[PDB]
C-alpha cells in the first residue's frame, strides 16, 4: 500500500556510526559549517537509503514513506524529558537530530520558525504535563484533527520528517491522502479556484495576512492540497464552493489511516500530498514516554526571504 525501506543490520550500523562521528565532529546545529556541509555529509549515508528517498521525492506519488530499522541507542538517548525549555542543546540524542537533518538535506533545506521551540531547527514531540489538555505538539490527552502543516502560509513546509526515538505504546500518527475518484470533475474545478479563506494559527513587521485562496492545486488529475478544516471557511454566498469543500472533506476524512512510527522509524510526510494528525494517548510522565524529533523541509529556502531576518537564517519570523 505505501512503499517503505527496511534497513539491514549493516545499514543500521553504518547510519548509527555516521551520526556518532558527525555529532563528535560538529558543535551543535549552531555551527553554520554543519548546515553548509549537510548535503555532502548526507551523501555518506548508505546508497540504498539515498536512492530510496530520492525515488520518493521524484516520484511525487505517495503522501508518506518510512525508513525502518534504525539503531537508536536507548541508553545513550536517555529518559524522555519533562519539557523542551531550559533543556541544554545539544543533548545525548544529538546523533538522531543530526540524522534527521541529513535526511532533510536529501529532500530540500531544513528550516524552522523563530518563535517556535526557541527557534530550534529540530523540534521535540513529547507529552508535557502542563501542556497536557491543549491540542498542540507537546500534548497527550487530545487531538482528532488532521491538517496540512501551516496550510495558511505561503512558505509552509514542503515535507515533514518525524523520527521516533521511542513509541512504547504504538501511538499512531494519522495520515491521509486524496482519493480523487469519489470527487466530481466539477467540484475539483471549484476547489482549484481562489474561493476559500484559510486563517492563520495563534502561533506565529509584515503580515500579510490578506487574500482568499484555493484548497487544491498542481495537476487537476492528481492534485496537491492545502487543508486545515479548523481554520478554513467559505463566504456564505458561495454555495458551489461550500458544496465542493464538503465533498473534499468527506473524501479526505474517510480515507485517514493510522501510521505508527515505532522506535527506529523515520516517517516522511509530503505536505502537499497528505494531511496528518495525532491521536490521543495516556502519557506516563515517568521518562519513558513517546518521543519524536521533527524537522520541517523547504524545497526553496529563497522563496521565504521576505519573512527571514537575514539571508543566512533558516528561521521564519
What are the residues binding its own copies (CB under 8 A)? 35-37, 39-40, 43, 47, 50-51, 54-55, 58-61, 106, 158, 217-222, 224, 272, 299-303, 305-306, 308, 311-312
**Nine-digit cell string for 277:** 494528525
Q: Which does 51 bind (CB under 5 to 8 A by kind): its own copies, Fe ion, ligand AKG, none?
A: its own copies
**Nine-digit cell string for 147:** 491538517
Q: Which does 144 bind (CB under 5 to 8 A by kind): Fe ion, ligand AKG, its own copies, none?
A: ligand AKG
Question: Of the two residues 145 and 239, which places its CB atom closer to ligand AKG in the complex?
Answer: 145
Q: Which stretch binds Fe ion (CB under 5 A): 188-196, 201-209, 227-235, 284-292?
A: 201-209
**Position 158 contacts Fe ion (CB under 5 A):** no
Whether the CB-CB separation of 38 and 101 falls below 8 Å is answered with yes
- Within a 10 A sphere around the Cβ of 312, how many other Cβ atoms? 8
**Position 139 contacts ligand AKG (CB under 6 A):** no
Question: Of the two residues 194 and 200, which places its CB atom closer to ligand AKG in the complex?
Answer: 200
Q: Which stretch binds ligand AKG (CB under 6 A): 89-97, 203-211, 229-237, 274-282?
A: 274-282
Q: Which stretch binds ligand AKG (CB under 6 A): 7-15, 80-88, 248-256, 272-280?
A: 272-280
Angstrom CA distances, 40 to 37, 86, 102, 106, 150, stand at 5, 32, 9, 9, 29
Write out the binding residues for Fe ion, residues 118-157 only, by CB under 5 A.
Answer: 149-150
Burial of 243-270, coded b for 16+ CB within 10 Å and e otherwise, reads: ebbebbeebbeeebbebebebbbbbbbb
Q: Helices (DSSP H) in the chain: which residue ranges? A: 9-25, 32-42, 47-59, 74-77, 94-107, 185-191, 239-254
**Position 25 contacts ligand AKG (CB under 6 A):** no
- Indicate the angle between helix axes 32-42 and 94-107, nearest 10 degrees: 70
Angstrom CA distances, 153 to 121, 188, 214, stand at 18, 22, 12
Q: Which does 179 bind (CB under 5 to 8 A by kind): Fe ion, its own copies, ligand AKG, none?
A: none
For the CB of residue 125, give the shortest distance to ligand AKG in the complex, in Å.
5
- Binding residue (CB under 6 A) for ligand AKG from 137, 163, 223, 264: 137
Q: In what order do the strands lie in the sheet with 257-260?
A: 257-260, 172-176, 275-278
Report the largest interatomic distance among the alpha carbons of the chain, rounded to a whole angstrom: 61
For the CB of residue 310, give the shortest distance to its own copies in the complex, in Å.
8
Judge whether 61 is annotated as a binding position.
no
- Binding residue (CB under 6 A) for ligand AKG from 66, 121, 125, 165: 125
d(CA 266, CA 69): 9
Judge whether 70 is annotated as a binding position.
no
Q: Which residues contact Fe ion (rule: CB under 5 A)?
A: 149-150, 201, 203
**Annotated binding-site ranges for 2-oxoglutarate:** 173, 278, 290, 294
**Annotated binding-site ranges for Fe cation:** 147, 149, 276
**Annotated binding-site ranges for Fe(3+):** 147, 149-150, 204, 276
Amino acid at each position: 500500500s505505501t512503499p517503505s525501506y527496511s534497513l539491514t543490520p549493516a545499514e543500521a550500523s553504518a547510519v548509527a556510526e555516521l551520526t556518532l562521528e558527525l555529532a563528535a565532529a560538529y558543535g551543535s546545529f549552531g555551527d553554520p559549517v554543519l548546515l553548509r556541509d549537510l548535503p555532502r555529509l548526507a551523501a555518506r549515508l548508505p546508497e540504498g537509503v539515498q536512492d530510496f528517498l530520492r525515488e520518493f521525492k521524484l516520484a511525487d506519488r505517495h503522501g508518506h514513506t518510512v525508513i525502518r530499522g534504525h539503531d537508536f541507542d536507548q541508553r545513550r538517548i536517555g529518559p524522555t524529558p519533562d519539557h523542551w525549555r531550559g533543556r541544554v542543546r545539544p543533548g545525548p540524542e544529538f546523533p538522531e537530530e543530526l540524522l534527521l537533518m541529513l535526511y532533510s538535506a536529501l529532500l530540500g533545506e531544513p528550516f524552522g520558525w523563530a518563535t517556535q521551540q526557541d527557534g530550534h531547527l529540530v523540534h521535540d514531540i513529547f507529552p508535557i504535563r502542563s501542556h497536557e489538555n491543549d491540542q498542540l505538539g507537546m500534548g497527550s490527552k487530545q487531538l482528532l484533527t488532521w491538517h496540512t502543516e501551516d496550510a495558511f502560509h505561503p512558505y509552509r513546509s514542503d515535507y515533514l520528517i518525524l523520527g521516533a526515538l521511542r513509541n512504547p505504546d504504538h501511538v499512531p500518527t494519522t495520515v491521509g491522502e486524496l482519493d480523487l475518484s469519489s470527487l466530481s470533475a466539477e467540484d475539483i474545478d471549484v476547489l482549484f479556484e481562489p474561493r476559500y479563506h484559510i486563517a492563520p494559527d495563534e502561533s506565529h513587521r509584515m503580515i500579510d495576512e490578506r487574500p482568499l485562496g484555493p484548497l487544491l492545486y498542481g495537476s487537476r488529475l492528481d492534485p496537491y492540497m492545502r487543508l486545515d478544516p479548523y481554520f478554513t471557511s467559505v463566504p456564505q454566498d458561495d454555495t458551489d464552493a461550500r458544496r465542493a469543500y464538503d465533498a473534499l472533506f468527506k473524501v479526505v476524512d474517510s480515507g485517514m489511516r493510522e501510521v505508527v512510527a515505532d522506535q527506529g522509524d523515520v516517517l516522511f510526510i509530503d505536505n502537499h500530498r497528505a494531511v496528518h494528525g495525532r491521536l490521543p494517548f495516556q502519557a506516563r510522565y515517568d521518562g519513558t514516554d513517546r518521543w519524536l524529533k521533527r524537522v520541517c523541509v523547504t524545497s526553496d529556502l529563497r522563496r521565504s526571504r521576505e519573512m527571514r531576518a537575514t539571508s543566512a537564517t533558516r528561521l521564519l519570523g
